[PDB]
C-alpha cells in the first residue's frame, strides 16, 4: 500500500500536533493524498475512518484535510476532473454526524467551511444544505 501507507502516515501524524494545525502540516497531508490519487477511494476511506475515530479536538482538523485535498485536487486536475469531492460526497452525511461530535465551540468552524463550499461551488448546494441544517438542529437542542 506504498502510496496509501505514506498518506496514512501523514494523516495519522495529526495526532502528534496540538490544534490549530499548521499550513505546513496540512500541505504535507495534501501532497501525500494527491500522490496517492490512483487509490483515491482508499484515501477517502482513511480520512473518513480518522474522522470517525479521532479525539474531539481533531474533528475540525479532519474536515480541514477534506477541504485541503478537495481544493488542491480541483486546482491541480481541473474542477470537473477532481475525483475527491464526488467520492467524499458519497458518505458525507455519516462524515458530518461524526464531525459534529467536536467540542461545542468548534461547531462554528465547520459551518464556516460549509459556507465556503457553497459559495465557491466546491460541493453541490443540494449536498451542503442538509449539512447546514444539521448544525442548526444541534444549536437548538
Amino acid at each position: 500500500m506504498e502510496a496509501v501507507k505514506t498518506f496514512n502516515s501523514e494523516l495519522y501524524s495529526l495526532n502528534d500536533y496540538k490544534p490549530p494545525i499548521s499550513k505546513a502540516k496540512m500541505t504535507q497531508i495534501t501532497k501525500a493524498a494527491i500522490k496517492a490519487i490512483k487509490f483515491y477511494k482508499h484515501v477517502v476511506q482513511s480520512v473518513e475512518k480518522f474522522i470517525q475515530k479521532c479525539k474531539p479536538e481533531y474533528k475540525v482538523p479532519g474536515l480541514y484535510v477534506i477541504d485541503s485535498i478537495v481544493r488542491q485536487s480541483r486546482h491541480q486536475f481541473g474542477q470537473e476532473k477532481d475525483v475527491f469531492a464526488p467520492r467524499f460526497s458519497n458518505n458525507i452525511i455519516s462524515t458530518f454526524q461524526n464531525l459534529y461530535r467536536c467540542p461545542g465551540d468548534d461547531k462554528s468552524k465547520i459551518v464556516t467551511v460549509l459556507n465556503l463550499w457553497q459559495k465557491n461551488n466546491v460541493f453541490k448546494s443540494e449536498i451542503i444544505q442538509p449539512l447546514l441544517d444539521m448544525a442548526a438542529a444541534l444549536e437548538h437542542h
Binding site: 490549530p20 494545525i21 499548521s22 499550513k23 505546513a24 502540516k25 496540512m26 482538523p61 480541514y64 477541504d67 485541503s68 464556516t112 467551511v113 465556503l116
Partner: peptide, 8 residues
C-alpha cells in the same frame, strides 16, 4: 501559521 479554509 495555521491552516485556514479561506486561503488559497
Amino acid at each position: 501559521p495555521s491552516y485556514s479554509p479561506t486561503s488559497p
